[PDB]
Write an enzyme that holds these catalytic residues in place. Structure first.
Site, short mmCIF file in Angstrom:
data_model
loop_
_atom_site.label_atom_id
_atom_site.label_comp_id
_atom_site.label_asym_id
_atom_site.label_seq_id
_atom_site.Cartn_x
_atom_site.Cartn_y
_atom_site.Cartn_z
CG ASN A 95 0.19 12.03 0.37
OD1 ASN A 95 1.38 12.10 0.18
ND2 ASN A 95 -0.56 13.08 0.36
CG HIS A 130 6.89 5.55 26.32
ND1 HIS A 130 7.64 5.25 25.21
CD2 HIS A 130 7.50 6.61 26.90
CE1 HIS A 130 8.68 6.06 25.13
NE2 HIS A 130 8.62 6.90 26.15
CG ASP A 180 6.38 16.85 17.56
OD1 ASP A 180 5.41 16.10 17.24
OD2 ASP A 180 7.16 16.59 18.52
CG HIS A 204 5.92 12.11 27.05
ND1 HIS A 204 6.97 11.34 27.51
CD2 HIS A 204 5.94 12.00 25.69
CE1 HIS A 204 7.61 10.81 26.48
NE2 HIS A 204 7.01 11.20 25.36
CB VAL A 224 -0.45 25.66 24.44
CG1 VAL A 224 0.45 26.88 24.34
CG2 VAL A 224 -0.87 25.45 25.89
CE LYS A 257 -4.17 -1.89 2.07
NZ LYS A 257 -4.92 -2.00 0.78
NE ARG A 280 15.45 14.77 23.31
CZ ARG A 280 15.79 14.85 24.60
NH1 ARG A 280 16.79 15.64 25.00
NH2 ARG A 280 15.15 14.12 25.48
N1 LIG Z 1 6.65 30.03 17.06
C1 LIG Z 1 6.70 29.98 18.39
N2 LIG Z 1 5.49 29.86 18.96
C2 LIG Z 1 5.46 29.80 20.29
C3 LIG Z 1 6.68 29.86 21.13
N3 LIG Z 1 6.31 29.83 22.45
C4 LIG Z 1 4.95 29.74 22.41
N4 LIG Z 1 4.46 29.72 21.13
C5 LIG Z 1 3.09 29.68 20.68
C6 LIG Z 1 2.21 28.78 21.50
C7 LIG Z 1 0.90 29.59 21.51
O1 LIG Z 1 0.05 29.23 20.37
C8 LIG Z 1 1.28 31.02 21.36
C9 LIG Z 1 1.36 31.93 22.55
O2 LIG Z 1 2.26 31.34 23.46
P1 LIG Z 1 2.95 32.21 24.59
O3 LIG Z 1 3.75 31.31 25.43
O4 LIG Z 1 3.49 33.48 24.10
O5 LIG Z 1 1.65 32.68 25.37
P2 LIG Z 1 1.32 32.55 26.94
O6 LIG Z 1 -0.10 32.98 27.22
O7 LIG Z 1 1.69 31.18 27.35
O8 LIG Z 1 2.32 33.66 27.54
P3 LIG Z 1 1.84 34.90 28.52
O9 LIG Z 1 0.46 34.66 29.05
O10 LIG Z 1 2.07 36.05 27.69
O11 LIG Z 1 2.93 34.84 29.57
O12 LIG Z 1 2.58 30.99 20.86
C10 LIG Z 1 7.93 29.99 20.42
O13 LIG Z 1 8.99 30.08 21.10
N5 LIG Z 1 7.88 30.03 19.09
#
Ligand SMILES: Nc1nc2c(ncn2[C@H]2C[C@H](O)[C@@H](COP(=O)(O)OP(=O)(O)OP(=O)(O)O)O2)c(=O)[nH]1
Ligand SMILES: Nc1nc2c(ncn2[C@H]2C[C@H](O)[C@@H](COP(=O)(O)OP(=O)(O)OP(=O)(O)O)O2)c(=O)[nH]1
Ligand SMILES: Nc1nc2c(ncn2[C@H]2C[C@H](O)[C@@H](COP(=O)(O)OP(=O)(O)OP(=O)(O)O)O2)c(=O)[nH]1
Ligand SMILES: Nc1ccn([C@H]2C[C@H](O)[C@@H](COP(=O)(O)OP(=O)(O)OP(=O)(O)O)O2)c(=O)n1
Lengths: 481, 484, 481, 481
Positions: free
Chosen positions: A7, A121, A201, A103, A44, A4, A248
């Site tokens: 995708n 696990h 991820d 986890h 989140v 099989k 990681r």
């Molecule tokens: N691209 C990226 N996205 C992240 C990172 N840390 C968290 N996120 C994503 C996960 C959430 O969809 C969104 C907001 O996460 P934050 O940690 O800034 O918000 P949080 O409410 O946890 O922080 P706050 O209440 O401001 O202390 O951003 C990162 O380092 N890089």
């Protein structure tokens, strides 16, 4: 039965041998469609809807890619079609043991519900695998495609969990040692499981993956190292290997240990503990098990998935009221409040046996400020997280073998100082997060004072917002200024 | 309190106003985390794990992007912060009415369980919205941020479902004609070009592992509001017309490859069958403790709130002997013992199969008399016939005939563009029907027989020759001169 | 004149104000289409065909995004449409001074051709900009869109090169100090130029970018720091900033300092040196300039691009024969051969004034191996590469200001120990690459022996392949064993 | 000599056999680094900086992927290592004959400069290939790796240009017919060359590619069709094939025939024509050639690249003044002005012999409008573009063979009506673009009146903006109203 094609958004068109299709098309494997890869992380990062099922396919595909590539460059290794299938099956099946919310289940729930047991696990995956084989008549199918069940089942299990007890393995001889480094690499952690989850991820979280596994595969070779045939990487890839572990660790910091993802896992764990006396899961012979005991019967464990969360949330039984309330607070986003983060200093290392005493210490701190409310131990959660490069204090790159372009069959070692001074000086650390179960403004203000005072008393690092959240507390500590 | 940022893999960092956060943080919205976007498609495309929750955030975000872009380019339209929030909320909330496995539920299950009723996810979204507002004290929060609940709640619902009355004159009450263009953002009833499609193209592609060819940001950059027959409407730049034809071509390709995949559909069918067999026995507690069934939860929003994909697992994990038949169908899905695909055909000429005739089709297939020696005889009940209507969103009509454009030399003057002004390589028709046939008997001899009946039926009805006709039924295809 | 839209593969649809279009549509700007961003890197990474033109559009676009986002979140900063345009123009124009093959030209060629002069592409960009404005009648156009040429031209130049010597800037006052941190951030290196090249270079190289600049923009704020308004990041983002520089260093290691990309830059520089007496470039008033002197006349420099390479390669003049031969060796891939890499240890830091003596030291080493050929100083190239986080030995994150969620207008500092023990302990290092100009097998073998012996004598690190390429030499050094 | 790995942003890590490396590392192949894939398109889409060199590597890589995948699935075909290398080489080398700015050169320039000659890039590729082999001693290297130069060189050329002269090919017999369908598929246009350019052009243009070539490869098989072994596609994939050509037509419409990209190609062609008497290119035996005659000598053609544009632009010779002025207008973006687009209706088909009479017809139109200026034939450009699915009026899918899951060795045909009624009814059409060489506001207004009047007179389709650009003209035509 023919091959099989499936995708996958990460790997594109993946071919599955009919034996692999047979393993996949079982309740024990399809169960993984109902277990989120990242647990409470979907609450989140909304793109993280992916489940362990699709990750497992990917691990199986990549395990086949590595083993095929080695065989094709080095026919003298005598890798057989049989070896390939065994490595693919171990790859497909190494996630079978995961429980609800991945986890969360083996990291938080089982250690609290069953402190006496040593559950992983990995061990779950072996047991589920055995149950999958036996329940579904897989041994004859294995024989039909040239496998020898006695040895090969042993091999597959050893690939997942390591030696089941000098050459410690029975499934393959030292001649084929390198095969044990593909699916779950016990020597240094460099394996195809990481490579799938990095790519998958990232694709889902919306964060970009910096590690190039296809490159690694192209440069990989087998060489003799201390009378074993082991996988060696090209010398000049060493910087990319340090980067792999750096990636990681970043993913752990940004996503997998996000402070709110962790508190959601903690709240779900709390609901599960409160529901544990009342939820019943039917196992072998109609016998009933609980959430915390389903790990003792694979037929019951087969039915233990993320569904437990909804079964609790949708329940009407008054016995499940306390569990159900906690999950309802998650839907309203009335979560336990984050107070802050710190780390130990010096040679201080907090042991698992001291975790329970930490909320008590925080509540015993005597911040010299006027407080409206007094908080107690039970009002605090303290979460201790061990961040490392997969091998405690050790540098995993000290346990990698390399080869050079001028002598591709000669294995060598490379030390940290032969690579860069910009690399980490330590490979393990602990983060300590504190949260308050009392969410009102006055409790939170008080929680902050206790927390920061506790940091000061214990000689932990100054929280990043320390001066703002506890301006009257931080001046006393000269080490912080 | 303050804005939140959410990271989405399709759109990146999305900002949510605190009112939107308050709407999201409710059982009625969070419910959408437990409904797969593509239903049974996840059982064919393993990356399609995504749920309606995240798609909804994306639609709310894009609705805000389009409305904001129009307001920035054309201040004279007087788009208010209030208008923006209302359009975002309609965007966020237009998927609230979806049921377990999304289109399975309203496309297959409810029409078979409640043939007397007329249910759509749209209507469901209005009712769920009302319930969300009332159950969670949202009206005072709306007032706190400058909305006027009476007129604005009406506006939001009209954006989702269209005019709440029969008009047979300006049919909307939430906003006047000078804001008509606002009704074209979330769910565009005039031509289907709306932000809901744009999210699902990007998101579905990302998850399926198929590449999206439509560039919605380009479209937004070129969009303007112009007066058209005494309404202010959204107009696209003339030269984008090819891209618009391409948009609908992409939608059709996604339907062909993914959303109507022959096996994704048969899995939806088998799940629907299980649900039908379970319907008398599953109980869902609604308002005042009353019990509802899977098929009646649509009548009580409190019960519907608890109706999600979880029903599948509740059935699969059940021990009640009353659920045995339902449970056994779902177990066949896990073993991949699925009904077998026999083939596909289409009607020809002016032939158009009506919904009222769908039930008679398996009977016709079983009544065919292929002149071949057969070891088994098959009956009507052994066949499934699935009829799929593929179109550009407006039956037989070209949606581009209902789009207004502007030119670079006169950006405020709306014009029309016909198909012949674009290309001769475009489709000559905009609707068609596909007919798939499957056999419930999966053994080799039944399947061989099913193929002979099927192809003979195609011949008798004057349908198109199946693509593998000569291979699967070599003794049947010669009789039909039109195929040879 | 109205706004134009350009479609960019990195940033999508970018809108250009008509004043910007006017600046772009000049020989001085369009010149950048003929200068590869990565120089000789295209001869290693075939996707790296991108030129400085499209990078410049992206920098201008991002400079506008950051300034617009700050203005929208903080109206109290009084950012004007005029400010936005000036920042975009600086962004668009900060690469105008690059020469043929970008960093080859100002990193290798001009320092060898004009050792007495102090030339940077930044200075070149200011001079080119002035020339662009004056040659194309841009001042009246600027006035037509509300700019004030005297101040605003000064502002734009200051953004590119810094102060044109307490508050050292004349184009804008201290209440707009944060505007100087967008295009070229002299305080800590966090600017939109890096954000475009990370994304664009990665796209073209086929390496994945791990830094998320949009996230950064969303979390950026202006706060008062020691009586200046500066751009501050959210405290939480401190890990992402360390990651940004870690990414920059990875891109330098893998791509921008690729050992073969560097040697191709070096060979092209050699051809340019040998052609310098014969190529003539017509500048202002019909005067003739050379490749090495075109930097003294902007009209001539306008015509100085990667085309010089082809002019040399396609020449028939016997005077250009030696230059032409070097370029022909590049086409046949008869390149100078890489011998190896090492680094200094302890506190040893090699000074620029000692660079020229290094090939002599290598050739003076006395290996202890029987050698067919003897090599001389001129047979060796020694390339010393300073790798750092943009500020020599300093940690740039010590020069970043942060804010916390509880007090978004209060700036704070965060130390390395408040973040992680897994971060670098040092922020600068040197790599030393050696190559041999004699490419035959015996010369290369010999070059390796000298090289490794020289490492041993100087107490440099052991080359990664030392035991393979010089097995008879590495045993003598107990520190390596 | 060993295998080299090259990292490509489209295909990732590509392995190159040392024979391929030897062919690549020649002046004849490296030349392709100086020829933009999309010609003038880079002046519209700034990401389209990519050159024919990297496309050629990709075509060679994909040709190897397809041939290898067929051999692996169907050992009975007896595909040899030799066959694989020959197909890779044909893939690598099929773009060798392109000239400056790719399709500009053979599509516009040569037809105007050498109307008597019949030149194609395909022919050019065979001639350049022969020259590459002979000039670089490649025949002995081929023998060293098991190729047989006589038959294999013939085979490679036949793959590029088709039969050089019942089975018409001499390089391979009918039992290997399918090998001729990989690199340039003369039967239906489905070949690996398209697959690379779709992915690569999209990556660079910033437009998304919707065709999945890896899927196609996975479903491809060889079956007997009318006594030839041909490549067949799985029946199911027929929709994806129609989509492939639909994608090709979209890319032409959006990018490759962009109205401004085409006018920039036309202006560059004009400059080349004016420079043709004065530019000298040295070929074999020191003989001098012109731009238009370099096609007669491969040694001269080797030196004919995009560099010719800069040589003109940087020239000071008064003989090149007119040519140089045209290129300078391009830098200032003073381009010929687009007037509009129309199409013929009914069965009207404009023949190549009538192209030159079209500007005259436009200038002879008598729009009844008051005009400040009168325009003449020489003020108009009329560009006629034939858009199709690669085979004139024919449906290429009628020339594709398929197989079904139940009988994978039995080839079948699938008609349009067996697929969908939503597919195109015709497979060819013509677009007519008109431009004005007089760029002032009054000339352009007048050009629009003439143009639309001409459309009316000829019964062409109403331009999309007709009512806006010529409001007094469009009312006269009842068919439009
Ligand atoms: N691209 C990226 N996205 C992240 C990172 N840390 C968290 N996120 C994503 C996960 C959430 O969809 C969104 C907001 O996460 P934050 O940690 O800034 O918000 P949080 O409410 O946890 O922080 P706050 O209440 O401001 O202390 O951003 C990162 O380092 N890089
Ligand atoms: N994504 C996308 N980009 C396109 C398409 N057509 C053109 N572009 C790109 C090429 C250019 O960088 C940019 C502007 O192209 P346009 O054709 O919209 O501008 P142009 O000035 O030719 O048209 P105008 O002056 O408005 O008639 O957009 C398209 O269909 N899709
Ligand atoms: N994706 C990726 N590509 C790289 C990296 N380093 C180099 N490349 C690219 C550049 C080339 O196109 C291709 C091969 O470069 P290598 O540096 O592996 O080969 P090179 O011939 O320099 O080394 P060798 O002769 O094997 O010592 O890979 C890397 O770290 N990641
Ligand atoms: N008017 C044109 C025609 C082609 N191309 C470019 C776009 C494609 O990347 C490539 C396709 O043409 P090639 O010469 O590479 O090969 P073919 O002519 O065989 O293309 P096809 O077979 O698709 O007709 O050339 C272009 O920029 N402008």
């Amino acid at each position: 039965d023919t091959m099989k094609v499936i995708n996958d958004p990460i790997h594109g068109h993946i071919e599955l041998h009919p034996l692999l299709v047979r393993i996949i098309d079982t309740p024990q494997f399809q169960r993984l469609r109902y277990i989120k890869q990242l647990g409470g992380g979907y609450y989140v990062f909304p793109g993280a809807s992916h489940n362990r099922f699709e990750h497992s396919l990917g691990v199986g595909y990549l395990a086949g890619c590595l083993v095929h590539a080695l065989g094709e460059k080095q026919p003298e290794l005598q890798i057989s079609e049989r070896d390939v299938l065994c490595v693919q099956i171990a790859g497909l099946c190494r996630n079978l043991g995961h429980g609800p919310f991945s986890h969360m289940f083996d990291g938080r729930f089982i250690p609290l519900a069953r402190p006496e047991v040593k559950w992983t696990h990995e061990q779950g995956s072996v047991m589920m695998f055995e149950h999958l084989i036996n329940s579904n008549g897989i041994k004859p199918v294995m024989e039909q495609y040239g496998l020898i069940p006695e040895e090969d089942i042993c091999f597959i299990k050893e690939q997942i969990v390591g030696p089941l007890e000098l050459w410690p393995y029975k499934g393959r001889p030292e001649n084929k040692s390198f095969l044990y480094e593909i699916v779950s690499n016990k020597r240094n952690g460099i394996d195809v499981d990481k490579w799938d989850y990095f790519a998958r991820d990232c694709h889902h979280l919306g964060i970009q993956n910096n590690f190039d596994y296809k490159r690694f595969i192209k440069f990989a070779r087998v060489c003799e190292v201390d009378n074993e045939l082991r996988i060696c990487a090209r010398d000049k890839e060493v910087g990319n290997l340090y980067d792999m572990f750096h990636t990681r660790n970043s993913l752990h910091r940004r996503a997998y240990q996000h402070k709110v993802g962790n508190i959601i896992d903690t709240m779900i764990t709390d609901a599960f503990l409160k529901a544990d006396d009342y939820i019943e899961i039917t196992g072998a012979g109609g016998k009933k098990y609980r959430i915390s005991t389903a790990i003792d019967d694979m037929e019951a464990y087969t039915k233990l998935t993320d569904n437990i969360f909804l079964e609790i949330l949708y329940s009407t039984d008054p016995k499940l009221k306390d569990a159900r309330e906690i999950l309802k607070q998650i839907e309203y986003r009335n979560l336990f409040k984050y107070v802050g983060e710190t780390q130990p200093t010096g040679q201080i290392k907090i042991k698992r046996e001291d975790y329970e005493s930490l909320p008590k210490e925080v509540a015993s701190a005597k911040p010299k400020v006027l407080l409206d409310v007094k908080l107690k131990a039970e009002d605090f959660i303290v979460d201790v997280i061990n961040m490392d490069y997969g091998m405690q204090e050790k540098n995993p790159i000290d346990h990698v073998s390399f080869y050079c372009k001028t002598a591709p069959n000669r294995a060598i070692r490379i030390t940290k100082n032969q690579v860069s001074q910009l690399l980490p000086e330590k490979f393990a650390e602990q983060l300590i997060r504190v949260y308050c179960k009392k969410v009102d403004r006055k409790s939170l203000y008080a929680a902050r004072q206790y927390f920061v005072q506790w940091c000061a008393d214990r000689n932990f690092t100054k929280p990043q917002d320390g001066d703002v959240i506890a301006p009257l507390i931080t001046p006393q500590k000269k080490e912080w200024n």
